Design a protein around this ligand. Structure first.
Ligand SMILES: Nc1nc2c(ncn2[C@@H]2O[C@H](COP(=O)(O)O)[C@@H](O)[C@H]2OP(=O)(O)OC[C@H]2O[C@@H](n3cnc4c(N)ncnc43)[C@H](O)[C@@H]2O)c(=O)[nH]1
Ligand SMILES: Nc1nc2c(ncn2[C@@H]2O[C@H](COP(=O)(O)O)[C@@H](O)[C@H]2OP(=O)(O)OC[C@H]2O[C@@H](n3cnc4c(N)ncnc43)[C@H](O)[C@@H]2O)c(=O)[nH]1
Ligand SMILES: [Zn+2]
Ligand SMILES: [Zn+2]
Lengths: 361, 361
């Protein structure tokens, strides 16, 4: 049936909740940024990434919250690959002048992710709670998150995550060599621009290896994904004013929503997050490049194709990173087989049954 | 067929095409406002009137327009009608509170828009010249137009003009009590609340004495007008998530785009502006208050019903100001018979041959 088309529209109805929430979050981040700049700290060269506009990105995917990245460039750097992650690395320097104060954050000859993030979080908590102009608080530092999560409850509880992000203009680490496989979908010209762009390192402590290493940083391809999320067609004009519409974002928002609503009532599903669905659909679009395969008069069949890919992913325990092939996101190290089978049941049960979890008048 | 549902779809997909300039103007005005209220001028106590946001499509230009109002609260104000117009006033002050900068703008006992406006422009160019150096214009000082006109100079060229408005927390003026007929549609209770919020004054020169008397202000209800736009239904669950959709704001956007198209092609239609349609749809909603009259399935009949109403307005030369019943926007002294007749022609011929002007996919 076309029940899905009506689910989209009940979701699409974010009037005065996504556009009026932007203006304020635009402000808080634009004010916090400018007060973080020119204020005597190592982060004076901090700048907002064009990480997906409020109303372009983070609108049809995870509405309850926002995220922004605060990038900061660094000079000549050495990446040491953390064991066999492909994603986790240790960041060192090349010379270390005193015309570069990021050094105040090295524990050893490695830039520490924790000394930087704690001082970053410090300066935010201290400059954010220094004005009584809007009701904006800082949530508890949750062990594991690389973020400073802004809690605001002016109309309702909103969450803005600030991810400090090292920017590197050098060559993309070699673990991403045969990743980003868009050559039969986005073309080789497009893939080549994308890789000339910088890459980013977020302070995500690797919970494995020696112990919870906080000095470890994780790669983050956020700028690139929004590119793929916005330029998703094999035809340049896809879902543009003078071109044809597809259901790629449709399927993704439904998958996002479906997984969102199950996670809400099954803490057994805490090990799955939206990035699993995102990387899932990236492999889907790499499989079916032609925008004919994503026609809005086959939303049902397109959505079902995705459901089946994700179930085969949860069964074969295989979820290789879109950019880092060697890093399997559904490793048994990362996710117990209990939660995969548990997820498979709920996704099966909803799918066999016209998705009763979507039933809201 | 129902080709207008498709024309609405092509404006939803033209709104995102401007989300950038929209955020451009948010950063430009918020930095401008902040710069205004951190310096010694008569407008240090200025605020942005929350006249909605750039999610404005129903109410004004789908392709090129951005309005903004700066509210400056004033003391006990003594409005004296400009003879009988209802809409035009002189602003008198008998008792000026010790400490009010609104003294320098006086002429005897009557506030000068002219002298205030000409200090409103100065204080701005001394802050948009030092507001770093963006690509937003600082346009021509114009006549009549109570604004410091600007426009987008980044991408294409969207327009953005800043209207100084006095805020008065007094009683709504005597000319506007028989106004706002929203008793059998929105309620007596909400009407009472809507007339207990301030009224605004924009500095609009008039057409009397000779013409352009250099001491008058016009009434402004853009705040209340916004409220009625977003609270248009008689059922409070209107257009909400847990309620039923209507086609009200849909019809408005169709009619405003129809008129802009025609306007964009004929000099003869220069007397007509977007606020003529708004007023016409406010009466249109007072006359048909039931929400089932505006079902999204009746869209063409609703749109044609409004088209027929607007024509009965043009041709009988009656379109009362919604908050000032005595001020006839389509009066004989305001729009001549030549123009109405012209307009009644291209509309009708634009209503019987389907919608040729709406033939740009
Ligand atoms: N805002 C944000 N938060 C991120 C994050 N990467 C991890 N986290 C959060 O930190 C905690 C540590 O968990 P772990 O077991 O992995 O050490 C967790 O609270 C984690 O939240 P979560 O993993 O369920 O994610 C919440 C939020 O972050 C997205 N996310 C998780 N993992 C990733 C990766 N590898 N790349 C890009 N985004 C990721 C989630 O989808 C969700 O939106 C981060 O980048 N940003
Ligand atoms: N933003 C704005 N601009 C206004 C305005 N009142 C007048 N104007 C513009 O100033 C010039 C003087 O013309 P007039 O013949 O009235 O002396 C004109 O260029 C006038 O513009 P326009 O009237 O053709 O339309 C421009 C713009 O402003 C809206 N608007 C016109 N009239 C009103 C009234 N009475 N109330 C609320 N909005 C009005 C138009 O729809 C359009 O967007 C003003 O109040 N604000
Ligand atoms: Zn598309
Ligand atoms: Zn409605």
């Amino acid at each position: 049936p076309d029940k899905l088309k009506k689910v989209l529209d009940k979701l699409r109805l974010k009037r005065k909740d996504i556009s009026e929430a932007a203006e304020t979050v635009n402000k808080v981040v634009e004010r916090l940024l400018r007060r973080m700049q020119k204020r005597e700290s190592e982060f004076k060269g901090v700048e907002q990434l064009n990480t997906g506009s409020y109303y372009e990105h983070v609108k049809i995917s995870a509405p309850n919250e926002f995220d922004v990245m605060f990038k900061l460039e660094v000079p000549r750097i050495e990446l040491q690959e953390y064991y066999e992650t492909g994603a986790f690395y240790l960041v060192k320097f090349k010379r270390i002048p005193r015309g570069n104060p990021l050094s105040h954050f090295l524990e050893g000859e490695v830039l520490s992710a924790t000394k930087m993030l704690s001082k970053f979080r410090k300066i935010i908590k201290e400059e954010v709670k220094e004005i009584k102009d809007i009701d904006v608080s800082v949530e508890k530092e949750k062990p594991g998150s690389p973020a400073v999560t802004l809690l605001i409850r002016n109309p309702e509880e909103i969450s803005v995550d600030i991810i400090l992000a090292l920017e590197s203009k050098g060559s993309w680490p070699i673990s991403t060599k045969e990743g980003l496989p868009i050559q039969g979908w986005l073309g080789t010209k497009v893939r080549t621009n994308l890789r000339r762009e910088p890459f980013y390192l977020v302070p995500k402590n690797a919970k494995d290896g020696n112990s919870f290493q906080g000095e470890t940083w994780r790669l983050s391809f956020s700028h690139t994904e929004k590119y793929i999320l916005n330029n998703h067609g094999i035809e340049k004009t896809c879902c543009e004013s003078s071109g044809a519409k597809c259901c790629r974002k449709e399927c993704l928002k439904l998958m996002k929503y479906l997984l969102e609503q199950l996670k809400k009532e099954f803490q057994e599903l805490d090990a799955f997050c939206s990035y699993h669905v995102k990387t899932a659909i990236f492999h889907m679009w790499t499989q079916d490049p032609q925008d004919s395969q994503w026609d809005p008069r086959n939303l049902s069949s397109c959505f079902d194709k995705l459901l089946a890919f994700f179930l085969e992913c949860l069964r074969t325990e295989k979820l290789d990173h879109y950019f880092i092939p060697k890093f399997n996101l559904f490793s048994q190290e990362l996710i117990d087989r209990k939660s995969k089978e548990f997820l498979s049941k709920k996704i099966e049960y909803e799918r066999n049954n016209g998705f009763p979890i979507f039933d809201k008048l």
